[PDB]
């Protein structure tokens, strides 16, 4: 399993380093410093072998985070681990930075040693760890933490009580689209996640469900209510879950039923393509004037309901490999250009539901080769919109707690619907 584990600053120094196994060397830490962090040959992959040793790493901030083994460990696993780790270190102090890391030695270690033993990753969570990691008692607390960590609901449960009793679900949905020269969705998909932020009491059993096929016909009922046969009720291409959902029980009953972590944890990832809602249409065309003008055109359209708010608009349009004399125009928002880095970026504040906006560009031409041309890179989009681009909406969230008296009716429950960018192309 995991042998070396080592964290570096951007200039190449270690920040923390901890070795679980005889296999590893002073050699290791160096070599990585030497070979990934420094090879003139940037382009890589994220795992390496140097000399029968394998080296995985992530970058965060500009702060490298390497794990090392000299066996044939499970790839995936060691990765997921470095991820879980970064989440534990944020969990303890959020910003993962050089000064933030340096000023935390002793913790990081107590953790490192705890989180993962002999390379075997242990109980990795953060609701176990926060309960026995300082930054004082007897047998009580002792076997408490023991049996909690060892048990079947580590991951963040003990005996919990809140002054105000609430839960927020966030539906965060990325629109991934690659769409041919003149409008035709070549890659057409939406990757979604349900971020649940929950402040609850005790051992609250949650059931959960969404849009998935039925037909229709307190003291705070809505004023209007539909009736009219809510068709297109949408089912889910594929959903993967979190550690807490009883996947046996789900595989069986198609319910999403669990006991949750406290705080802001992610409950499922899921993807959809069917009965998909259209996003933000991009229309890109380049033409010529004389022997010395290349002219670039981008038209932007949007596909909403009448009433709605398109936010944080960013459009990337490329200059040719080199650029003579750039000339950019806007009809809404504000325009940005960056040279030697060679690209053009449009930034828009607010765009209404079902608009149409123009963006123009010009580029001069003088002899660069002997008769050789250019090839145009895809035009790329960044955005936020409050629709739920798949057409998902949360149907239900059952909240039963057997220990304490209270159940479902006592809970403030809020829901948000956010529709982020992801992957978004063309100009051909």
């Amino acid at each position: 399993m995991i042998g070396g584990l080592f964290i570096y600053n951007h200039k190449g120094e270690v920040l923390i380093s901890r070795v679980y196994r005889d296999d590893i060397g002073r050699n290791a830490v160096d070599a990585f410093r030497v070979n990934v962090i420094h090879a003139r040959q940037q382009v890589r992959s994220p795992v390496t072998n140097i000399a029968r040793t394998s080296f995985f790493h992530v970058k965060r901030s500009n702060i490298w985070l390497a794990a090392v083994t000299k066996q044939n460990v499970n790839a995936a696993m060691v990765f997921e681990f470095l991820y879980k780790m970064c989440d534990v270190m944020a969990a303890y102090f959020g910003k993962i930075s050089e000064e933030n890391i340096k000023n935390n030695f002793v913790l990081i270690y107590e953790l490192l040693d705890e989180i993962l033993d002999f390379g075997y990753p242990q109980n990795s969570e953060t609701g176990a760890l926060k309960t026995f990691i300082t930054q004082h008692q007897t047998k009580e607390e002792q076997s408490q933490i023991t049996s909690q960590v060892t048990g079947q609901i580590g991951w963040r449960r003990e005996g919990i009580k809140y002054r105000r009793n609430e839960l927020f679900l966030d539906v965060l949905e990325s629109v991934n689209l690659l769409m041919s020269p003149q409008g035709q969705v070549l890659s057409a998909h939406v990757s979604g996640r349900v971020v649940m932020k929950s402040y609850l009491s005790g051992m609250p059993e949650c059931k959960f469900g969404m849009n998935d096929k039925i037909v229709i016909e307190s003291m705070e009922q809505k004023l209007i209510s539909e009736e009219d046969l809510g068709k297109q009720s949408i089912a889910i291409d594929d959903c993967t879950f979190h550690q807490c959902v009883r996947l046996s029980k789900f595989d069986s009953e198609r319910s999403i039923s669990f006991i949750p972590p406290d705080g802001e944890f992610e409950l499922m990832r899921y993807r959809t393509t069917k009965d998909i809602i259209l996003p933000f249409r991009v229309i890109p065309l380049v033409r010529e004037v004389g022997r010395t003008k290349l002219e670039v055109k981008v038209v932007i359209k949007s596909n909403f309901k009448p009433s709605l708010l398109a936010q944080k608009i960013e459009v990337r349009i490329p200059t040719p490999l080199n650029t003579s004399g750039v000339q950019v125009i806007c009809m809404k928002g504000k325009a940005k250009y960056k040279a030697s880095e060679n690209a053009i970026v449009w930034k828009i504040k607010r765009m209404a539901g079902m608009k149409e906006s123009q963006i123009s560009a010009e580029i001069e031409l003088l002899p660069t080769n002997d008769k050789k041309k250019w090839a145009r890179p895809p035009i790329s989009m960044n955005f936020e919109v409050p629709f739920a681009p798949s057409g998902l909406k949360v149907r239900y969230l059952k909240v039963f707690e057997p220990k304490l008296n209270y159940s479902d009716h006592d809970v403030i429950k809020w829901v948000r619907y956010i529709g982020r960018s992801g992957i978004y192309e063309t100009r051909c």
Partner: peptide, 6 residues
């Protein structure tokens, strides 16, 4: 912002 669940 958000909208009540229930």
């Amino acid at each position: 912002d958000y909208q009540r669940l229930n």
